[PDB]
Amino acid sequence: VDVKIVNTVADLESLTANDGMVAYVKGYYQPTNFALAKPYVGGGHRIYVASRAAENDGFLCINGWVLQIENNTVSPEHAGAKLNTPSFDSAIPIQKVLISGCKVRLNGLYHTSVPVYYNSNTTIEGTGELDCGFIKTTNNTLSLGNRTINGKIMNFDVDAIMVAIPRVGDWYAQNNHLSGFTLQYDSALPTKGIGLYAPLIALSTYKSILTKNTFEGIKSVDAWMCTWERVQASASSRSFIFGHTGTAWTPNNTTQTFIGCWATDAGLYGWDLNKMQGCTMISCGADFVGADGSPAKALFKIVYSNVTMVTCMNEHLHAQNFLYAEGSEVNISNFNGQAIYNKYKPATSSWNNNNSMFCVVSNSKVKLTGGSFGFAYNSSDPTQGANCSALAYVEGGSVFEVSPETTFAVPLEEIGISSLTAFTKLGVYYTTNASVDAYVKGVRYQDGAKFSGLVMDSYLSTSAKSLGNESITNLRGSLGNAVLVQSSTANATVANGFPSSGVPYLVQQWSSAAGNNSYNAQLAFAISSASATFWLRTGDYGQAYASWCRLYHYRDSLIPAATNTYDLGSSGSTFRNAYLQNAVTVV
Amino acid sequence: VDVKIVNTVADLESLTANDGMVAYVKGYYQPTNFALAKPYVGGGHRIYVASRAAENDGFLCINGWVLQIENNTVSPEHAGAKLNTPSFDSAIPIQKVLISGCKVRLNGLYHTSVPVYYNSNTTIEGTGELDCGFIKTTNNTLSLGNRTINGKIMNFDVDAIMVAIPRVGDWYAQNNHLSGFTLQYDSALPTKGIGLYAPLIALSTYKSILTKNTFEGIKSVDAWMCTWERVQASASSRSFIFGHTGTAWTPNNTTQTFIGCWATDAGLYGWDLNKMQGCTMISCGADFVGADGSPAKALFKIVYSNVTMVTCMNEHLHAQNFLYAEGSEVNISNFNGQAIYNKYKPATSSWNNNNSMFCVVSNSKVKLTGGSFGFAYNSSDPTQGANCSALAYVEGGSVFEVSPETTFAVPLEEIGISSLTAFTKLGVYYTTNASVDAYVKGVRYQDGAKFSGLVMDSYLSTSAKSLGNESITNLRGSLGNAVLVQSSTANATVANGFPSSGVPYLVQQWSSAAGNNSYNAQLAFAISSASATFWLRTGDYGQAYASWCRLYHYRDSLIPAATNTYDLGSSGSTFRNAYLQNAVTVV
Amino acid sequence: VDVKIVNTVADLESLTANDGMVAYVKGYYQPTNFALAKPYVGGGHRIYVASRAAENDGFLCINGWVLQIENNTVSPEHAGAKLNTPSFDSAIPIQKVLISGCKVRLNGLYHTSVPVYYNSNTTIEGTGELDCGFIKTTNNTLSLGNRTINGKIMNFDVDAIMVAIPRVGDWYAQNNHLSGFTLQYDSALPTKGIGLYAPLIALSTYKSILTKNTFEGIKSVDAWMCTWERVQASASSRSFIFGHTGTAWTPNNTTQTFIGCWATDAGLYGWDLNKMQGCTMISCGADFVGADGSPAKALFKIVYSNVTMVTCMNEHLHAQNFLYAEGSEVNISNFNGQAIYNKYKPATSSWNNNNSMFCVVSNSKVKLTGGSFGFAYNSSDPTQGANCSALAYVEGGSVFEVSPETTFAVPLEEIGISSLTAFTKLGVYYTTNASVDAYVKGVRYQDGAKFSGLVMDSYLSTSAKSLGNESITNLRGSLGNAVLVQSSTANATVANGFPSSGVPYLVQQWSSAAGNNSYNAQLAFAISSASATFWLRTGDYGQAYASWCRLYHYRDSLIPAATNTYDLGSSGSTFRNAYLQNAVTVV
Numbered sequence A, B, C: 001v002d003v004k005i006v007n008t009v010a011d012l013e014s015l016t017a018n019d020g021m022v023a024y025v026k027g028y029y030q031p032t033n034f035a036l037a038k039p040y041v042g043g044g045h046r047i048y049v050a051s052r053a054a055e056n057d058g059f060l061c062i063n064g065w066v067l068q069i070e071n072n073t074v075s076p077e078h079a080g081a082k083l084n085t086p087s088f089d090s091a092i093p094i095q096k097v098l099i100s101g102c103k104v105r106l107n108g109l110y111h112t113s114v115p116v117y118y119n120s121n122t123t124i125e126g127t128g129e130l131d132c133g134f135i136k137t138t139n140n141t142l143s144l145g146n147r148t149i150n151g152k153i154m155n156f157d158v159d160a161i162m163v164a165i166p167r168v169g170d171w172y173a174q175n176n177h178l179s180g181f182t183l184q185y186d187s188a189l190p191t192k193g194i195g196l197y198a199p200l201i202a203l204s205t206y207k208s209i210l211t212k213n214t215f216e217g218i219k220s221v222d223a224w225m226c227t228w229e230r231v232q233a234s235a236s237s238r239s240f241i242f243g244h245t246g247t248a249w250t251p252n253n254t255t256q257t258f259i260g261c262w263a264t265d266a267g268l269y270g271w272d273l274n275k276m277q278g279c280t281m282i283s284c285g286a287d288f289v290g291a292d293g294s295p296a297k298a299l300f301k302i303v304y305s306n307v308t309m310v311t312c313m314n315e316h317l318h319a320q321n322f323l324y325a326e327g328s329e330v331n332i333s334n335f336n337g338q339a340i341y342n343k344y345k346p347a348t349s350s351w352n353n354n355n356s357m358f359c360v361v362s363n364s365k366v367k368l369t370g371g372s373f374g375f376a377y378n379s380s381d382p383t384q385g386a387n388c389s390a391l392a393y394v395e396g397g398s399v400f401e402v403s404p405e406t407t408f409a410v411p412l413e414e415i416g417i418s419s420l421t422a423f424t425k426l427g428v429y430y431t432t433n434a435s436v437d438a439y440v441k442g443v444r445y446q447d448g449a450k451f452s453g454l455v456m457d458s459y460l461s462t463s464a465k466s467l468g469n470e471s472i473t474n475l476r477g478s479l480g481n482a483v484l485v486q487s488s489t490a491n492a493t494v495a496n497g498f499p500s501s502g503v504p505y506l507v508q509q510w511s512s513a514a515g516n517n518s519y520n521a522q523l524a525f526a527i528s529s530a531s532a533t534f535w536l537r538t539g540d541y542g543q544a545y546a547s548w549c550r551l552y553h554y555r556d557s558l559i560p561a562a563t564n565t566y567d568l569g570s571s572g573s574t575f576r577n578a579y580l581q582n583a584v585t586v587v
């Protein structure tokens, strides 16, 4: 007995067959374009199972004829999809193969009028993102209704292209391995939806997946142990959303890795991350987030998360914040950020809504380890200087660290404590309940409870601060304990607080602490070519400096500061003897 | 002339055939469940090769009928395995396809009574870890015996599920690419073995592989240039073992990458790493290592290795050490460790067996770059305070570094040199041959040979240390060179070491070094509202401070410390002239 | 009607068939070795399309017989390639399948006389790099000629094995996914070429690809959003080249990730990187770069790039530089470099051509975050010490940072400002227009415009520098503001600059800044067991120290430094009264 030829699966119904007969189906449908290189698709061998003659699911069993699957791999064509045929709705055939338990190969573009879903242990593989994937032509949803999962009412009937749904009885859509295809809406649709709605996912790999022409690219609530490699989310509003708060399920995430992923076009947030724990981004990028005159809120919104960004990038950013960090630890190492137009302000500012590139709030920790940040504007810009952002606002127990090798397209301007939430210079502003360790203009500034002291069993060598035309009387606010040098005899003047003009000085200043009020002392060395005079003075807290006091020593006469004022000894504390070469001169 | 149908491969034996005849085999076996969606498996086209009529290997050539392989891909079914049939031993068919040179697709669960091995250039692909893989039902081994490899006697006859074995004449099982399946023992076995025994491996990728119900998960001796992505090792003893010392082969490893890998359930070590050079872990996790009252020895045991952990995690840890590092460099960046019950102690302690979270020994280097560590207990805990661990023990030339932004669930308690190996506070303890650079309670402590000095061509501005009700005579052990402020007049007393009571002070203390004994000097500014007194004293090494000395200066009388004791001049060193307003008063 | 058997595709031409007939072709060619396990390859089902009877492309349509492709996957055999047949040129069949739009499976070694190219959306999968891939047997090129792409005339007619070419109308060969094969020249060819010439590529993944027996391994001009996993480039001149400057296209690159990649054998550069932005290397290696007596120029040449290396390695390096960095930011974290023979020098040195391990020029930023660097030689080495390199040369606005936990095989020797470009010690040399923050022999050295000051609202406790038999008069070049201790009475001598010999000292030195010339002052405490003498002196800029001055205080007599020289008071500023126990002694 020999293998019988059948033109299409539709021809199987009428065929006369004995149990166990084998047929070769040329294609699922008759080709409509015989000029194609690949006209016959979706066919293959079938074996007749007489006991199932009444069954017809349009795919694995058609009138008893069971599809012979090679190495457990099928394509949507085998269930009746059509390739690169925009007028044909492939939704039903795609859905059948996605839940078949087979590996699914995507071999062109398939058009769909409803979302398609996958569950667990599903491998889907196309050959690349230009030519393989799903094009959704409507805003229609699934029609599955509510399900209760771990006591939470969940619903998957959203306007999306693809949806991840746990198996019945499970909590996560897990052990899935998707690669090499695109998810897009028909660009003509006036309203777009979600690319991939994957609320509850785990233990999965996503590679070389492109979603574009979406409102929201990739959207999840609770994801754990997933890797994302070369995933691009192009969206009009938010590209990547993790920890979505809009369901009954409590957001939480762990161990998400993103390698070579790409956020583009988002007008609200590039990345919207909530409860993202153990998250690493490696050589990721973000292009064209926000637009001129229509800023995004932030490139990265990172809330109750801990994230490391390793050699990541952005190009062309119009946003109020570069990073909004709330309750989050973010280590940004060797970033390269370009064309960031930091000219946007909120209508009404507040602790968590302000014009800073790094908005670091509510016990966050943000560190810039090297990197280059192309923030276009500081207050001296001739076109946007009046609109420039701060570099950072740090509040509510947070800490912000900037390495000495981090670079910026234009100079930083200042750093200091601030009670404001609206800024006018490219500076680092922090509250009294915050900590900073930041280089600004080559000077490292450390302040706050995390930086209370430095105790080292080590020797220390430092340089003096070289003074310009400035008063050493008026350094109580700007310097604490510090060594000063005045090497210009023109600037070493009595008007500038020195005991005598016209000679260089080294000055040790002591302080309780630089501040609005302080205790101070100074030791001044008036350094001449082969001699010096030595001077001490003190400043009480809230008082002007007291008069300078010239020290008496054995290589100088003892000349009092005023005549007929000071004594040698007292009646109760005499000097024992006095040895003079000449008799006392009584004036 | 036409393709002939054959029901099963067993039917090929009796088929009279001409050379070059083509047959289509419906399936390897007759189906036993025609309700399956996929009842016929393991069949395919065969061509008769008359000159091989006597051959039957049950797979590629059956009584001369040669299997026609599509794109060099086969399944164990093609050699006679059965899917999801626990009573059927698929060991032999699996082994045949694994050494066939074909890509191997795994399409369900296959049960095995012996280990299965792979060599080199082997690609094995399942669709996911829930439904694809090998279930081993015995503790049986391979039966290959000893082989000599590079002069070393090696033996692969261990109780494992899968074994990597070099090709004959080669040193490594290399250029393998495994993905998307599980290796498990039957949970009913009283004793379990190794999931993957891969002693000598190289130049390979492992992705989306789960081992569970094992004693040891993944075990290797010499691995180089391998990547591991989404590999989970669930084991009762040790999850991941690299550089295993128990063979004739010298352990050594290079360039192993772990991305999104997961160690679970291990009761001895989560990771046991030996000679692991150039190893990166990215967003890996570890859950349920140890149990309450049954601690693991360490989450990570890292010996003669260098490892970077980037945004890794753990949840639920009962162990004596978090990290044991011996001769190892470990950089832990932005960790997030949760529910670590640091209440375990060894019965006898030693340099390399002690109750510390970070046991940093024998020329190790361990750095915590940020991160959050959920160590539950310090000595204040009401229920486990008497059982808490140290944060760290550092010895034998090692260095331990804790960044200022690293956080802990409960506060660190102290840091200091210790000769003990058993601790009772959540502190940092180090020997005289160790180095530390660690923030404790907002104070950075640097000590040891790696931190001998700081030489900066930079100015320095610092604050004073504000004293409480403290003696400045008794700061020789706790402070070195340091500026002090006493802003409370009530505490500026002679009993507290001040020369002049009841005014605020700035004090410069000098020291050889804080310690049990030291050289010291102090300069004290006794600050009043418009004047001060200036004082010096010294303390010799091993001696009490000498008396305070009030300096003479040109804005004060010269009143000696005691009457009729000190002279103006000497017979051999006179003052030249003396100018007094009044005649000398001879008392 | 049944499926008709056909022996070979050559037998199709003489097949009388009706429209729609189905044939099964045993193999593309008649097998020549029926002892093979897989003798029949490249066949499959075909369907006769009468309207195309005149077409014969040797692949998808042979005299009207259209190939039935399963799940859009083919092998070069289906177009007439031969496996493991060195005398057969498979170039034309390979090329046909690479541009077919199918997934391409590689099932052995194919030999080629010309390069083969791919465009976009191409997936190519072998089972491993030992047995799958392309062997090029000539130095022949493509013959496609000049093409204008985005305004630049490009030419792809180079001697390469595989070439990436954009589709017409596109700028990049993109969305390709290649894995699991090798690209090699016939080792017998006297001259080798490029392995993979991929000038313009984007949005792609490359995995488990080996190039070897090449002159240049992988060569690109403009690559963005590509990942490379387990890619090995073995080349005689340069292993990896990105940003190749030798075309009309302006070099630029972004977001390239390398995980477990390996550069070997290169004699000029291991990695030659130009305009590589956002690049991360993870657990990559480099072996046998340069040769003894024939050094490479550098292991890494990194120009106008920013690169992070995470736990990377090298073994066996003969090169003039380890890293040449020009206008680049490079963070090298936890490196492990072994067997680096730093004994090579240029014939004529210059700012960008010198004998340094880290040549850090033109506004570069290079940081060593931990790591271990096996530089074999410093100047005391008994076989090569006279040839040793510097550790680093830092110039032209660059910054070089060395962490305290970075280790070296042999000790570093010195650090300082240098006007030289040729070195003879393993030191850190930098220009006056450069910055350093580097530990050397346990001491942190910070200098340059990036390290101008440190301002901390924090207290500070430090140790004294313990002096040997050294002069405190000659510490103006080596220390600035510093505390010194001399605990040896034998070394506290007038010859060593002390004012009073034979007692231990604490000394506070002040300075404008350590340098060739400086302002200085010193306060010396000559410490006896229950007393001290207190001394001040100053040194003017460019002058020797002035004489020491012993301070007068109330617990000492006032003995002048010379007799009959100094006065008590002056005619114009008298002391008011004098209280003596005895009458003045007029000497």
Ligand SMILES: [Zn+2]
Binding pocket: A024, A045, B024, B045, C024, C045
């Ligand atoms: Zn067939």
